Design a protein around this ligand. Structure first.
Ligand SMILES: Nc1cccc2c(S(=O)(=O)O)cccc12
Ligand SMILES: Nc1cccc2c(S(=O)(=O)O)cccc12
Lengths: 115, 116, 116, 115
């Protein structure tokens, strides 16, 4: 698992469950091309998005569908989505965890890059 | 001033100065059109991006050029930029402050929305 | 103003108004002595806690009464308060802004330290 | 494991390793009484601080020794420590994870309360 996503809900102090995540790779013509997607699990986690063979160096965007999440909980949110854009590298450590903490009018995102 | 941006640097405990910021508005045809741009001042603030008249309802993208900023300080950051996407003025005119806190491998962004 | 506090509410996208704040200073005998206190205004800011003269070198604790704040809004938060502990003025007089961002189960705090 | 701590380093995008953590319980006389302590592991995690039988309802303080961490990395930090104070409850979900993200002049902390 080269690329994992974990989402927390700062209002409820819980994993953010069933949040849609879409990942895009930047194409030579500078458009965003769908790459991977899924929904966070009961633990707020999304694994198995890609494989080591497919996850080549490149610029990637992870789009977290936060608006839909809040709407489903009946809470009025500010953002359309959270949007994490980064270069995936071959000589940084190998596993990328994109973590995201969600509030209605705020979010943070952290990259955890390890062996 | 209906749209302002304030950036702090979490490594130095200071405003983040000279941070480039590009603002886009989603057009009818669903492309991002350039809307406004600027750079944060020595107080880490960016004012005067737009006017009440020009800042109509729509979906806006505020792109904070975090990688350029860290690289100018000799840090290799994780993110290309922070991307703040939101609907604005759907319930009438509001004033928005987009606040961002920057670390090399992390950032947060908070919106303060007030009714003038 | 050498010590100021600014609080935002991450649920409402607004300044956090009427947030109680208590400041302590570690005494020679290692107890926390009361130093200053106040409440954030409608802009979520708290000024005038202390003076340049009284704000000497030492270890300070800024206690932001987050539980009282959320409870007054009918939210049951996780934390009793946010506790910001730091050495101040060890390299001469500085000006400190303690910024805090509040969610019911999360908070962050950032220091902006400038040399006047 | 009723109480776990996980610490991340926002400068390096890594677990914060070997960070001392001291936990205190508030006594009837309102002083803080040592309760548990340890150092984060290679994954930035600290488990086995307490047991379900010992972790009674009460006010607890988790003190994260952030100053020492930064000092060891040669980076000048603002805080003496990060300080997470909370009431432990019997009818909230059972497992508490105190998460903390560290920067030299900033930190955030999040409570993840689950089954
Ligand atoms: N993370 C933050 C918390 C509280 C306030 C913040 C501000 S501001 O209040 O100075 O506009 C700016 C950037 C980040 C902040
Ligand atoms: N698993 C996690 C550990 C430590 C911090 C985390 C954050 S945070 O940095 O925004 O608070 C967000 C999501 C997961 C985290």
């Amino acid at each position: 698992c080269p690329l994992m996503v974990k989402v927390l809900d700062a209002v409820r102090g819980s994993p953010a469950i069933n949040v849609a995540v879409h990942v895009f790779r930047k194409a030579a013509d500078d458009t965003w091309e769908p790459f991977a997607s899924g929904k966070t699990s009961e633990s707020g986690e999304l694994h198995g998005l890609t494989t080591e063979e497919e996850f080549v160096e490149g610029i990637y965007k992870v789009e977290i569908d936060t608006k839909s999440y809040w709407k489903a909980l009946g809470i009025s949110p500010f953002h359309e989505h959270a949007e994490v854009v980064f270069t995936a590298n071959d000589s940084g450590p190998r596993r990328y965890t994109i973590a995201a903490l969600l509030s209605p009018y705020s979010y943070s995102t952290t990259a955890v890059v390890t062996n």
